[PDB]
Symmetry: D2
């Protein structure tokens, strides 16, 4: 039965709450990219051992936080050895404004998953996005999503 990892950055702690919600649904372990865009070696090992990787980031100035992208750039290492090929991926984001820009962040997360040769799990539209504490409605859709990713990861392990 599946091992899902939620790897996320929070600037301000709203994407932290959404990650807890997704972790709860997927019964995932949580790994935090720090304020400097760094993940511990425990995080990276967990990602290489996961059946599913769910990416979390704020949308800031129209895209994923620089801290998330620094982590994405550093996944060039697992990418060159195809360590994450065929894993199940999902994502989430949350900002203070328009789902406008949030779709851009989600679309990057899909590209990052594709670059790694993974399978992308859509919301059961592309992935959860949310307004910025946070409404229970958003936390609930987030939690359902995490359960939906774990589910695919089980079927597809």
């Amino acid at each position: 039965s599946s091992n899902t990892v939620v790897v996320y950055h929070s600037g301000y702690g709203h994407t932290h709450r959404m990650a807890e919600a997704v972790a709860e649904g997927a019964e995932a372990t949580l790994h935090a990219i720090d304020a400097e865009g760094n993940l511990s070696e425990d995080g990276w090992a967990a990602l290489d051992a996961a059946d599913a990787i769910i990416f979390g980031t704020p949308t800031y100035m129209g895209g994923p936080s620089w801290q998330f992208k620094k982590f994405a750039d550093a996944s060039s290492k697992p990418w060159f050895s195809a360590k994450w090929q065929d894993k199940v991926f999902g994502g989430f984001t949350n900002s203070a404004s328009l789902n406008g820009d949030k779709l851009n962040t989600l679309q990057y997360l899909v590209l990052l998953a594709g670059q790694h040769g993974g399978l992308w799990v859509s919301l059961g539209y592309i992935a959860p996005m949310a307004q910025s504490e946070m409404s229970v409605g958003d936390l609930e859709t987030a939690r359902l999503y995490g359960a939906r990713v774990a589910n695919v990861a089980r079927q597809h392990k």
Copy 2:
């Protein structure tokens, strides 16, 4: 064992060759959106009965052909009844120029799959894109991709 459908539009017949290649890899049936953006009732029934749906379209003026989008718009019908929820999706495109714009077409295809609540299969980056007859290199990567989608569709049926 899985039923994959390749549903595609070709303006000029280069995306037709790429579809045959993907169909060969997935051992799929082929269904053509006509020059007016119409799919037969046989096509639509096949899509509702498929384990995997692979979308094919030219990239023209920076996006999917109008004929493909007319078909996408008409999939609002299966979308309202969630007929394609949890199906496995992939895509492909081909134009006469820059993979520039082709990524935009592929990204639409991912959105269309997400809108339907499907799972997206990346190239084993997001999906095959090709230059515009067509090189064997592109046809081969296309065929491998179709085999890779069928494979996921089998595991995940």
Copy 3:
């Protein structure tokens, strides 16, 4: 003093109201892509004679309506002769749901303008998007935008 054209498709008539609003701000003439994705020869002549072209379309299944894209595809003709090079462009969209997808439609409109070698006028974020009659708040931001495009088109004629 500048000639702005608003060229738009409305499925259902909500993007028609938004176009009237943008036309009012820019003091533009209005040209409608019909239900079949066709523009009159009067429309096409007006576009070739405009200092500014503002594109209007619904967001449907995650992108511009097929009728808008059919028109975009047909602008391949003015594109091959570079008829619209250096013109000032803007856009707008409106749907029944998430500004999620609406950003995708706006981003296509930017690509279409770029393909034509035009200059893109942002909202004074990328262009107006709106919920779907329609709120006065949205109509007002739309009208301000049309005045802002005409303004650039005057400066930059």
Copy 4:
């Protein structure tokens, strides 16, 4: 007569050569985001005093380098006071592979410009992209682009 600033990040120095080329065409000053995503106070002052801002970044793992995005995120400061409203913007990118992903980087640069309420100058498609020293063909198209941005910035000052 116009003041254009080229503000760029280079990982590896290929986007540095492209920036020199754009600077040459626009007769711009050059300002480098360092390896840590930091711009000097001289850079930021230059950006606030520019008639045109041209953004330069590598495409890495499917998007702008983390160092570029850290700079973009830090432009939240000029953004809150609308310091860059109505400025003329352009962009460029260069990677070792598919113009696939490069369009995504360019599209972010357009969003960043829009967020700031600027005008976007397309290649006279959206902006220059290039393969990765670098071919003279790419450097030349880049230089022409920088001249084309300065030109708009003069007209539109």
